[PDB]
């Protein structure tokens, strides 16, 4: 069972404060593990999976974000990004703190979530589900 749904209470171009988030989705689990695994799908900076600067949709601006590193834990997540915080938890809605500080250049940004919650590892016996949820979240700036 999984349910990754983002929600941007604020559109965009409203002058992003150095941190002020935007999209706070939520992950849901129910299996043996110690972490929630989520992503943004917006490539990656340096190579972490936690706090990582995302780009827009018209390739001309970046929209900083914070989430997989509030207090989460860096986990081996396909596609560079992907970190987990306590997961065994039934569900944790993670907020994405836009590390702005001034104003986020006009245009549109697209952010795709995907908090699987489960992390496959070298185990004796167990099924197979290496896909994890998927979600969108675009910031319309004008």
From Swiss-Prot:
Question: Positions of the region Disordered?
Answer: 66-86
Q: Does the keyword Signal apply?
A: yes
The answer to whether keyword Cytoplasm applies is: no
Q: Which UniProt keywords apply?
A: Plasmid, Signal
The UniProt family comment states: To E.coli AggB.
The protein depicted here goes by the name: Protein AfaD
According to its UniProt entry, this protein's organism is Escherichia coli
Q: What gene is this protein a product of? A: afaD
Which residues of the parent chain are present? 27 to 147 of 147
């Amino acid at each position: 069972s999984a349910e990754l749904h983002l929600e941007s209470r604020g559109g965009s171009g409203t002058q992003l404060r150095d941190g002020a988030k935007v999209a706070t989705g939520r992950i849901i689990c129910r299996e043996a593990h110690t972490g929630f695994h989520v992503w943004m799908n917006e490539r990656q900076v340096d190579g972490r999976a936690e706090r990582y600067v995302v780009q827009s949709k018209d390739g001309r601006h970046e929209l900083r974000v914070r989430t997989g590193g509030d207090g989460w834990s860096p986990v081996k997540g396909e596609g560079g990004k992907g970190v987990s915080r306590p997961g065994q938890e039934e569900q944790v809605f993670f907020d994405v703190m836009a590390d702005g500080n001034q104003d986020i250049a006009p245009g549109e940004y697209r952010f795709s979530v995907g908090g699987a919650c489960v992390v496959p590892q070298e185990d004796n016996k167990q099924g197979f589900t290496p896909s994890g949820t998927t979600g969108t979240t675009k910031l319309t700036v004008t």
